[PDB]
Amino acid sequence: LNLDPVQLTFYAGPNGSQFGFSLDFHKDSHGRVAIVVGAPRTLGPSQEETGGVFLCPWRAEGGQCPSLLFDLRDETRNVGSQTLQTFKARQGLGASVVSWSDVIVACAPWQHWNVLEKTEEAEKTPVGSCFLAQPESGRRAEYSPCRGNTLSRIYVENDFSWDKRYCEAGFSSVVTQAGELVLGAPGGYYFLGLLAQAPVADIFSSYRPGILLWHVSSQSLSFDSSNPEYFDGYWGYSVAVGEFDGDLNTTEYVVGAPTWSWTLGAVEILDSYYQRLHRLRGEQMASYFGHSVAVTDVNGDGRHDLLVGAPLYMESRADRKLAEVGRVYLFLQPRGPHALGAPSLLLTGTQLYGRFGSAIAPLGDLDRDGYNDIAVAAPYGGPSGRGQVLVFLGQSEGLRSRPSQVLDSPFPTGSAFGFSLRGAVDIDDNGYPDLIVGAYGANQVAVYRAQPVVKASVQLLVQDSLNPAVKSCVLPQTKTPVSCFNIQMCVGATGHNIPQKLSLNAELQLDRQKPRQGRRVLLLGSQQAGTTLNLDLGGKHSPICHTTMAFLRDEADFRDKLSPIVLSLNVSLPPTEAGMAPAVVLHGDTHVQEQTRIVLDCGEDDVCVPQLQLTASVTGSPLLVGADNVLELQMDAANEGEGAYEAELAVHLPQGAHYMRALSNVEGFERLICNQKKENETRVVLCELGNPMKKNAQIGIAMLVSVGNLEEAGESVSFQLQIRSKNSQNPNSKIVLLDVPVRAEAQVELRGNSFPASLVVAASWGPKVEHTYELHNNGPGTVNGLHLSIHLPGQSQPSDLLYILDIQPQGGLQCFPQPPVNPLKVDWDPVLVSCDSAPCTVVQCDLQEMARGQRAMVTVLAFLWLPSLYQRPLDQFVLQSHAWFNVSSLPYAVPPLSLPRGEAQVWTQLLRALEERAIPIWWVLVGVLGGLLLLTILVLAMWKVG
Amino acid sequence: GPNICTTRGVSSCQQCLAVSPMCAWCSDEALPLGSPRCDLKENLLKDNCAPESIEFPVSEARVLEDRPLSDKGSGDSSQVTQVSPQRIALRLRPDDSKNFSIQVRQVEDYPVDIYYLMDLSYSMKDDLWSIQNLGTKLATQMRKLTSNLRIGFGAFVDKPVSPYMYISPPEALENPCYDMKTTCLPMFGYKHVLTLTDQVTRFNEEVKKQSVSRNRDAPEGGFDAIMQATVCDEKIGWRNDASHLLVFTTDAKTHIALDGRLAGIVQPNDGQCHVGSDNHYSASTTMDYPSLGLMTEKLSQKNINLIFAVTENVVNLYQNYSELIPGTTVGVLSMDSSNVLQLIVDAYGKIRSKVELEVRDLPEELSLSFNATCLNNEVIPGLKSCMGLKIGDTVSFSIEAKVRGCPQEKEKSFTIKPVGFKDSLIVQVTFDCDCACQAQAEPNSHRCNNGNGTFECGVCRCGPGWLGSQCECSEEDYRPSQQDECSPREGQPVCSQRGECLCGQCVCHSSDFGKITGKYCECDDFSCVRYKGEMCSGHGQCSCGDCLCDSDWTGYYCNCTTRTDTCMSSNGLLCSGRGKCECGSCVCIQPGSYGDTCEKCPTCPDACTFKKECVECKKFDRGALHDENTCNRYCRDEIESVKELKDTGKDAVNCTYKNEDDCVVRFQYYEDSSGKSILYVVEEPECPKGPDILVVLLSVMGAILLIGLAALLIWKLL
Ligand SMILES: *[C@@H]1O[C@H](CO)[C@@H](O[C@@H]2O[C@H](CO)[C@@H](O[C@@H]3O[C@H](CO[C@@H]4O[C@H](CO)[C@@H](O)[C@H](O)[C@@H]4O)[C@@H](O)[C@H](O[C@@H]4O[C@H](CO)[C@@H](O)[C@H](O)[C@@H]4O)[C@@H]3O)[C@H](O)[C@H]2NC(C)=O)[C@H](O)[C@H]1NC(C)=O
Ligand SMILES: *[C@@H]1O[C@H](CO)[C@@H](O[C@@H]2O[C@H](CO)[C@@H](O[C@@H]3O[C@H](CO)[C@@H](O)[C@H](O)[C@@H]3O)[C@H](O)[C@H]2NC(C)=O)[C@H](O)[C@H]1NC(C)=O
Ligand SMILES: *[C@@H]1O[C@H](CO)[C@@H](O[C@@H]2O[C@H](CO)[C@@H](O[C@@H]3O[C@H](CO)[C@@H](O)[C@H](O)[C@@H]3O)[C@H](O)[C@H]2NC(C)=O)[C@H](O)[C@H]1NC(C)=O
Ligand SMILES: *[C@@H]1O[C@H](CO)[C@@H](O[C@@H]2O[C@H](CO)[C@@H](O[C@@H]3O[C@H](CO)[C@@H](O)[C@H](O)[C@@H]3O)[C@H](O)[C@H]2NC(C)=O)[C@H](O)[C@H]1NC(C)=O
Ligand SMILES: O=C(N[C@@H](Cc1ccc(OCCCCC2CCNCC2)cc1)C(=O)O)c1nc2ccccc2o1
Ligand SMILES: *[C@@H]1O[C@H](CO)[C@@H](O[C@@H]2O[C@H](CO)[C@@H](O)[C@H](O)[C@H]2NC(C)=O)[C@H](O)[C@H]1NC(C)=O
Ligand SMILES: *[C@@H]1O[C@H](CO)[C@@H](O[C@@H]2O[C@H](CO)[C@@H](O)[C@H](O)[C@H]2NC(C)=O)[C@H](O)[C@H]1NC(C)=O
Ligand SMILES: CC(C)CCC[C@@H](C)[C@H]1CC[C@H]2[C@@H]3CC=C4C[C@@H](O)CC[C@]4(C)[C@H]3CC[C@]12C
Ligand SMILES: *[C@@H]1O[C@H](CO)[C@@H](O)[C@H](O)[C@H]1NC(C)=O
Ligand SMILES: *[C@@H]1O[C@H](CO)[C@@H](O)[C@H](O)[C@H]1NC(C)=O
Ligand SMILES: *[C@@H]1O[C@H](CO)[C@@H](O)[C@H](O)[C@H]1NC(C)=O
Ligand SMILES: *[C@@H]1O[C@H](CO)[C@@H](O)[C@H](O)[C@H]1NC(C)=O
Ligand SMILES: *[C@@H]1O[C@H](CO)[C@@H](O)[C@H](O)[C@H]1NC(C)=O
Ligand SMILES: [Ca+2]
Ligand SMILES: [Ca+2]
Ligand SMILES: [Ca+2]
Ligand SMILES: [Ca+2]
Ligand SMILES: [Ca+2]
Ligand SMILES: [Ca+2]
Ligand SMILES: [Ca+2]
Ligand SMILES: [Mg+2]
């Protein structure tokens, strides 16, 4: 925000050394602050690249810096029949550099360690190491937790178990407040990742020169995992420390694994015992989610919040459906041990291939506003793709999407500016944090110094109405009575460690709306519509108030009466003096405006006394937690007294409420306008009802309010509505309070289906049949104690018509049948049958927790008993299965209201090819008998008659 | 009526035309009391003033060059013209949208050049033995569909950099495979071996001459090789007049960008070719793996159809990656790679069945809406691609371009290119926001109150405030104030208290945060829908406080999407046909169906329930609902009459159908993972023999007749 992009400090080192790859702040015993930088390609004495560390002191102009001296010679030792060799060539020393109190730790992951024994060898691999230096005591030490004397054949015979030959430890090093150095080894355990934690004091007291291999008593490493998901996970790219469980005894660790779960990206939060407390998965594969992990209390609630990056994230654009810009995720820690949910906030870059979010650096409270601030570096952001840094300020609701400030890269193309960022240190001792940004491409470091931030408050007071008839003052140098009034302007500057001398320019303009020649009011003294003054606020903690006299021109000089008079006050910094570089940056209420009017239609007393009445109605009473709740608020305002000046509707809504739309039923061309702004913590909505209205005016406004997720708002939510007016008498009407109850209810749907729909059996093991039941929590709410009972005919016996081959649940539900299903191992006129009549088998399923959106599946595979199928094959078969499910309670404070129930029936019918049932020939026999009787009687009648 | 041209305007021809998409100007002098020159063309025609000077520009979509689509391609590929028109000219008036139509056709045979990029991992050693006799078979199979074929071959192992290489022992540098006592060559990032050529003998000779290397890390950096092949067109010789195929084969994971940190490489990957005459990638040891975005961009630019051939272990991962990169076809490769020929043939058949369009050089000033049309007259709004096509099939598209305001360039151009095809349409749009009459200029005319102002097509604009019709009201003059000439429906504040009633009209002021216009100063900017700082949702533009959408969007907030590309399923039915698509999201109307396209349902009814008509038509060419022509309209599965009834299909299910003959017909449905739904049916279903009564009753009646005849002859004798 207040960072100065002009006055920057430049530090440079040897060319081609990738200087500025890693940087950090260092504090001595006397408080002197220096910058520790690591160059991973510094030329060594043997004309080979080995890396180095530089300690730049605080110089206003910068320049060359001293280089720390570390051993850069291969060390060979012989113990028994074993030979240990160390090769530091191309070790990349200074790749990761950290500082703690008076200890500087610089790690070289690429250092090579080799073990030889006669013929067999352990192979040369880049195990890496870390050099610790204490300049105050002039002490040096080395740390390498992946040094051993195990041959390669041993690992081969052990299936590469405990394969710590490729640790590359020291890629990401962190130090806790207790001084416990933690190093990440993504390549450890054969490209799986691990951590190595060790006290610094123990390392110093447990280091002996000439002892290449040693073991520390307190050395501890993470346990290897055989889960295939972790394969090629590179767990340990970024490591950070923080507090999540709320107990200060334990220090939680956060580790980023971009390649975890088949190139998915993840962030794992573990305790001090390497136990998985929580895991956060990525959004899109190959996004490199988890590249950088940061811990900071952005919201200021007292609970640490998490920031994650994904440079390789791909967005969607109209020109192209895919665009690689990167993303940044913000997670806020909820109250209690509740697990982290969806990302609190999402930030997306603009420039293509910008790798936004690669580096995130906390900056503390840069503006001293009570909220922490952060910086995000895009290596190749901006229109020119030379890198950029975006500063995000903190707030109660999180972080503002719009970047407060953007800093470009003065270096040319290929500088890779913004690769590593660090801050939250008052290097200049100016009371505000500064920033340091390295650039290995340009081989330089740029230091930005923050400037003091001053908050300005401006207040303007003027008579509500003016009476032309009353003329108390007199024009200067004459004796012409004229109306007059007093204008008061109060200006107040606040800040921390503000300069003792401060100057500001205040411009007061009267009737700025009208042209200069058309102005109606002027200043009594200067007889001008505008004036400028210089205010010295240096050391004036209390606000400075000034008063002036203004007059109104003669009536004959103008004809407009209903047009209000606008008075504007503008506060600005002094014009840039010699040398530019303003001392401080001023922000806040730097411009204020007010409107007045002439006494009109206020009665004989000439004083307006408006009387307003307000009524409010609410529609949409049922509010469901976790649902898109929409409330319709209808406010009707009426005026029974005189016209009210500057009448507006002010509405205060709960934390989870928001403003979407508002219309006016009365009048089709009113064009009502509303705005929403955060006053202190809640988004208050002000609607401009209208300028001074006519007598007996009624206005109705219907607005839509969207209520978000709410779990602690209580039984009911409250809304406040009021009428705001600038009139001296009756400035506001009666306050209206509306209580909307909140009730939680969820609906769960049970469905069932049997396959195949139609089955034919011809005329051991019979045809397969599968019945599947699905339970879905379609309702926005959540349920607990989900219980289900499925009843089927048969008891899984040979005599039973159907034999339950197997049952499979899915979704975590615990299901148990009764009687036992599948007693044998088994290495392989419709008739209605139900549990009520036929033998009943009941399977009971339970689910203590059932989150919204999850689906529980139950599948049963069975077949028709062929020995029973053969018997009586001329009768149709229709089996039935009955599922009944309900719940016990809900995870919500509101007791209301029971529910939901569910019944499901699944019918499976079997068919046979042209059953041999007795065809109704009985009708044919009856017809034949009738015909025979008719023939016989006809013959008898025609024969006896003759 | 007042309409919108007459209202919120009447200042000049530029504004008069710019207020609304369609307006007409009466340049010729006429009565000024009727507020003319800005109204519907019909209204002006009623008021006359048409001396051939009417200024009513209309957008045009004239075609510059167009040629017929070639029926077949055998030679002279330079003028295939498979896509028409080649180039068109568009002239759109400001705040107007115009649309045109294009057609896409596949011209039968088309030359094809295929580059086979293969991994040489240890597990692939056996696979290398299965390619020694693949060139002849591939040439013979491809000859049926293509007459001219080009084949190139390249091999890769892994990135040659520590720790991916066995640096120690020193003897292992030239023979890392020393533990197993085998022969191997040094690891190489990429080694092109055979350039594109039509000689099968060269391909056969090239194979069996290479070997298999060794690597430690399971993932293989094939993206580097793919990018080098795509960019190094000159090195291998890509031909712009042929179908480009790149068959990438591997049996292990693949690295991504920023993965070189382990090896110490930090330089971002560059798309420039770095392959010399040595046929090696020099920057392999110093260049990081390419990013997905750059790979996709280069693939689209070079128009290369990428075909993955991987084992079932990583087939799911490669399928997940496939949906990201456009124009990619996946496949399953056996351990012995004995199905490589069939797999590549299937991939070639499938890729040509998918058609997609891409927009290039498209400025953000204008927006495009696409409508697709497959075979038949069926049209799918909000779609730019069609599925379920075949060789020689023709599809249609409609592209509508809408512009906002008036860009200050007057010349813009863009291109619409189908995937994997050289031919593309070039669309040039020119903005004509200035009235023709303005060319007269007449900066000084005596009609502007004795030549103290500027004249323009019947309107005098004068000074910094002189707005009167005769250019006399001035800005400081007009002190007396009239009535019923500044506000409508007297009884409300003049100009809505926003402006000054001067010159007989409301002049707007306070030009802050935007511009204010209108007769009474009622329409203003900086009054659009906002959420956290955005204006008009960041997609459309707000006029008079209403945030009108641009193309591809609709709604008051202009946040609901209209295009259905995202919600398009692979079965050719929007959201799989089980639901609708709103704002790019699928809503499943049918209960029990969920997912991105509602396709993932466990409890849906079996397919055979609604496949009865298809099988009925196939087996008898008749049935109910035949008038609607539903025999082949939704069921794309292939029906075959096979009496096997013993296929071991994993994703195969038996089912039964009922016919009017009362004989149940049992048939199998197999939904292969490749999507080739196939039905197996038994021809002439065996109806059990029922009739056994007609003969019996015939015999009974014959016996009765014989008895009657015996009685008759007895009577005769008696
Ligand atoms: C590409 O795909 C999109 C998305 O489906 C299509 O956009 C739709 O196109 C339809 C066809 O035009 C629109 O519906 C129709 O279009 C009428 C415009 O033509 C007028 O017709 C009247 C008939 O008396 C004439 O007098 C006029 O002079 C015009 O010629 C629409 O008026 C109408 O739709 C209704 O219009 C009324 C009045 O405007 C609205 O109040 C009502 O809400 C409704 O929109 C008619 O049904 C359809 O609206 C449109 N979709 C939209 C705008 O979202 C493209 O047309 C496709 N591309 C091509 C080249 O066809
Ligand atoms: C969901 O609904 C079912 C049925 O609608 C409820 O089943 C209830 O189960 C209990 C046993 O767990 C029944 O009590 C038992 O009754 C038997 C006699 O049938 C008696 O011998 C036992 O000592 C015991 O008292 C209870 O009657 C039964 N409810 C009904 C209405 O029959 C179930 O409780 C509901 N809730 C859940 C979470 O499942
Ligand atoms: C390739 O694509 C598949 C399919 O889109 C993806 O795998 C899917 O990953 C999601 C992760 O959210 C799985 O859902 C989750 O399942 C777990 C149980 O394993 C459950 O506890 C979670 O609540 C969530 O529902 C989903 O089942 C899974 N589906 C499949 C078919 O794998 C993923 O993007 C890629 N999978 C690969 C490459 O294996
Ligand atoms: C067009 O606008 C111009 C100003 O931009 C007008 O010029 C001024 O017009 C007034 C008309 O009353 C002139 O005043 C008269 O001029 C005579 C002769 O010079 C003189 O005796 C008096 O001062 C008389 O009031 C004024 O001189 C003239 N100014 C200039 C610099 O020429 C012009 O009149 C406008 N055209 C019209 C009204 O047709
Ligand atoms: O296929 C081969 N290499 C492959 C590469 C490759 C090498 C080893 C390998 O497993 C690693 C499994 C990880 C186990 C974890 C270890 C830590 N704890 C949890 C489990 C996978 C791929 C290539 O070169 O592409 C290959 N086959 C061989 C046969 C004999 C000797 C060596 C051989 O190497
Ligand atoms: C979009 O393009 C279509 C096709 O060019 C236009 O529809 C044609 O309109 C003309 C005259 O209006 C008719 O003669 C054609 O028969 C129509 N063809 C079709 C296929 O509809 C349509 O008017 C265009 N719409 C816009 C807004 O420009
Ligand atoms: C357009 O604007 C709002 C605000 O951005 C949109 O809100 C998004 O809604 C989708 C699905 O409804 C969610 O997945 C996003 O997370 C929402 N984003 C935000 C920032 O809230 C919404 O899509 C549109 N508005 C309305 C009223 O539909
Ligand atoms: C199965 C069929 C072919 C048998 C039919 C044979 C019938 C028509 C025969 C069997 C016995 C017969 C009868 C036997 C004896 C006599 C007595 C004689 O004085 C008059 C005829 C009379 C009454 C015969 C009439 C015909 C008769 C009823
Ligand atoms: C050495 O440093 C200079 C400093 O500007 C730089 O320009 C140059 O490229 C570097 N390398 C060589 C070989 O000079
Ligand atoms: C840490 O543990 C010690 C020893 O049990 C305890 O005294 C202290 O309170 C703990 N810290 C906390 C609870 O913050
Ligand atoms: C207030 O004064 C400053 C001084 O430069 C100026 O930049 C700013 O625009 C002024 N405010 C307004 C509203 O004009
Ligand atoms: C906002 O709420 C806080 C509660 O801490 C209160 O102190 C403050 O006065 C409120 N804001 C206003 C403008 O009153
Ligand atoms: C069909 O039934 C046969 C036996 O009748 C069985 O072997 C087969 O698995 C079933 N399914 C299919 C798809 O054939
Ligand atoms: Ca803790
Ligand atoms: Ca917090
Ligand atoms: Ca802050
Ligand atoms: Ca500072
Ligand atoms: Ca009064
Ligand atoms: Ca490999
Ligand atoms: Ca193989
Ligand atoms: Mg391999």
Q: How far apart are CA B441 and CA A242, in angstroms?
A: 72
Ligand 10, residues at Cβ distance < 6 Å? A 247-249
- The reported resolution of this PDB entry, expressed in Å, is 4.1
Cis peptide before B111 (omega within 30 of 0): no
Written as one string, the DSSP assignment of B194-207 is: EEEES-HHHHHHHT
| b/e per residue A768-778 (b: at least 16 CB within 10 A) | ebbbbbbbbbe
> Alpha carbon B191 to chain centroid distance?
35
Distance between CA atoms of residues B156 and A179, nearest Å: 47
Q: How many CB pairs below 8 Å do chains A and B form together? A: 162
CB distance A682 to A697 below 8 Å = no
Exposure of B370 in the CB half-sphere (CA atoms within 13 A): 20
Backbone angles phi, psi at B294, to 5 degrees: -65, -40
CA distance A644 to A610: 5
Do A408 and A460 belong together in one domain?
A: no
CA atoms B620, B622, B623, B629: torsion sign: positive
Q: How far, in Å, are A12, A158, B640 from residue A447 at the CA level? A: 12, 52, 75
Nearest to A132 by CA among A168, A100, A92, A164: A100
B20 touches ligand 13 (CB under 6 Å):
no
Decide if B55 contacts B24 (C-beta within 8 A). Answer: yes
Q: Does A907 touch chain B (CB under 8 A)?
A: no
With contact defined as beta carbons under 8 Å apart, do B189 and B159 qualify?
yes
Measured distance CA(B239)–CA(B234) in Å, rounded: 9
Q: How many helices (H) and strands (E) does chain A have?
A: 6, 67
Q: Is A851 helix (H, G, I), strand (E, B) or coil?
A: coil
Q: How far is CA B671 from the centre of its chain?
A: 27
Q: Write the residue in B166, B481, B656 that is nearest to A559 by C-beta.
A: B481
Partners of A504 in the beta sheet? A535
Query: Per the structure block, which two tokens stand in for A921?
Result: 């020939």
Classify burial at A746, counting beta carbons within 10 Å of its beta carbon; exposed 0-12, middle 13-18, buried 19 or more.
buried
Residue A26, domain member (yes or no): yes
Those of residues 383-412 in A touching chain B at CB distance below 8 A are 400-402
Distance, in Å, from the CA atom of A484 to the CA atom of A548, rounded to the nearest integer, reads 10
Of A168, A320, A756, the CB nearest to B606: A756
Residue B168 and residue A400: Cβ atoms within 8 Å? Answer: no
Do A458 and A444 lie in one domain? The reply is no
Distance from CA of A393 to the nearest CA of B (A): 15
Q: How many residues comprise chain A? A: 946
- What is the span of the domain harbouring residue A521? 453-598
Contact check, Cβ <8 Å, A262/B609: no
CATH code at A461?
2.60.40.1460
- E-only strand ranges, A629-697: 629-639, 647-652, 657-664, 673-678, 683-690
The Å distance, Cα A829 to ligand 21 centre, comes to: 65
Q: Find out whether A828 and A886 touch, Cβ atoms under 8 Å.
A: no
Residue B379 phi/psi, 5-degree rounding, is -125, 135
For the four alpha carbons of A435, A438, A439 and A445, in that order, the dihedral sign comes to positive
Can you tell me whether residue A199 is helix, strand or coil? strand
Do A749 and A773 meet the contact criterion of CB atoms below 8 Å apart?
no
Residue A918, domain member (yes or no): no
Q: For residue B668, which atom of ligand 13 is closest to its CA?
A: 13
Ligand 1 neighbours, Cβ below 6 Å, are: B 99, 371, 381-382, 398, 554
Q: How far is the CA of B381 from the centre of ligand 1 (A)?
A: 12
Query: What DSSP state is assigned to residue A696?
Result: S
> What's the longest Cα–Cα distance across chain B?
146
Q: Which tokens sit at B149?
A: 């074929």
Residue B429, C-beta contacts closer than 8 angstroms, at least 6 positions apart: B90, B91, B92, B366, B401, B403, B412, B413
**Same domain? A519 vs A372:** no
Smallest CA-to-CA distance from B586 within B572, B571, B569 is with: B569
Please indicate whether, in this complex, the C-beta atoms of A400 and B532 are within 8 angstroms of each other. Answer: yes
Q: Residues enclosing ligand 8, CB less than 6 A? A: B 707, 710-711, 714
Cβ within 8 Å of A, B 276-295: 291-294
A533 within a domain of the structure (yes/no)? yes
Residue A35, H or E segment: strand A33-39
Query: Domain containing A808 — which CATH number?
Result: 2.60.40.1530
Measured CA to CA, the distance from residue B206 to residue B193 in angstroms comes to 8
- Asked whether the beta carbons of A131 and A141 are under 8 A apart, the reply is yes
Indicate if ligand 13 lies below 6 Å from the C-beta of B668. yes
The SS3 call for residue B245 is strand
Interface check B296 vs A, CB under 8 A? yes
- How far apart (Å, rounded) are the C-alpha atoms in residues B113 and B240? 10
Q: Tell if the CB–CB gap between B656 and A759 is shorter than 8 Å.
A: yes
DSSP A412-426: -TT--TTSSEEE---
Using CB atoms within 10 Å of the CB of residue A483, give its burial: 0 to 12 exposed, 13 to 18 middle, 19+ buried.
Answer: buried
Mutate to test the interface with B, among A127, A321, A511, A942 (most CBs of B within 10 A): A321
Token representation of residue B603:
């409890």
Considering only the C-alpha atoms of chain A, give the largest distance between any 2 of them, rounded to a whole number of Å.
159
In whole angstroms, give the CA distance from residue A90 to residue A113: 13
- A592 in the same domain as A632: no
Helix (H, G, I), strand (E, B) or coil at B520: coil
Residue B511 annotated as binding?
Answer: no
Helix (H, G, I), strand (E, B), or coil: what is residue A756? Answer: coil
Distance CA B374, CA B379 (A): 7
Which residue, A549, A565, A598, sits at the end of a domain?
Answer: A598
A298 and A381 share one domain? yes
Q: Given an 8 Å threshold on Cβ–Cβ distance, is A285 in contact with B609?
A: no
- State in Å, rounded, how far the first CA of chain B is from the last one: 113
DSSP A66-104: -B-----S--EEEETTEEEEEE-TT--BTSEEEEETTEE
Of the candidates A890, A886, A900, the residue with the CA atom closest to the CA atom of residue A845:
A886
Write down which residue in A720, A741, A762 finishes a domain: A741
What's the Cα-to-Cα distance from B605 to each of A212, A772, A775, A902, B658, rounded to whole Å? 70, 12, 17, 21, 17
Question: What is the number of the ligand 10 atom nearest to the C-alpha of A247?
Answer: 14
Q: Identify whether residues A469 and A428 lie together within a single domain.
A: no
Using alpha carbons only, how large is chain A's radius of gyration in Å? 41
User: Which mutation among B444, B452, B467 tests ligand 4's pocket best, with the greatest number of atoms within 8 A of CB?
Assistant: B452
A885-920 in b/e form (b: 16+ CB < 10 A) is: bbbeebebebeeeeebebebebebbbebbeeeeeee
Contact A657, A707 (CB under 8 A): yes
Joined together, the tokens standing for residue A294 give 């940061």
Q: Is the CB of residue B323 less than 8 Å away from at least one CB of chain A?
A: no
Q: Which residue has the tokens 């016989």?
A: A936
Output the six-digit token pair for A608.
């307006």
- Which residues 626-655 on chain B approach chain A with CB closer than 8 angstroms? 653-655
| Dihedral angle computed from the Cα positions of residues B442, B446, B447 and B450, in that order, rounded to the nearest 10 degrees | 140
Q: DSSP assignment, residue B436? A: G
Contacts of A115 in chain B (CB under 8 A): none
Last residue of a domain, one of A448, A463, A485: A448
**What is the rounded distance in angstroms from the CA atom of residue B538 to the CA atom of residue B534?**
6
Helices B135-143 and B340-351 pack at an angle, to 10 degrees, of 30
d(CA A683, CA A658): 7
Burial class (CB in 10 A: 0-12, 13-18, 19+), B709: exposed
Whether A637 is in a domain gets the answer: yes
Residue A934 in any domain: the answer is no
Asked how this structure was determined, the answer is cryo-EM
Q: Nearest by CB to B509, from A258, A513, A772: name it.
A: A513
In chain A, which residues have their Cβ closer than 8 Å to the Cβ of B296? Answer: 322
Residue pointed to by tokens 């007049």:
B241
Going by DSSP bridges, is the β-strand pair A421-423/A435-439 parallel, antiparallel, or unpaired?
antiparallel
User: Is the preceding peptide bond at A756 cis, omega within 30 degrees of 0?
Assistant: yes
- Give the other-Cβ count within 10 Å of B30's Cβ: 15
Is residue A941, in this structure, part of any structural domain at all? no
What is the total count of domains within chain A?
4
Q: What is the dihedral of CA A935, A937, A938, A940, to 10 degrees?
A: 120
CATH number at residue A732: 2.60.40.1510
Q: What type of residue sits at position A939?
A: V
The interaxial angle of helices B292-302 and B222-231, nearest 10 deg, is 30
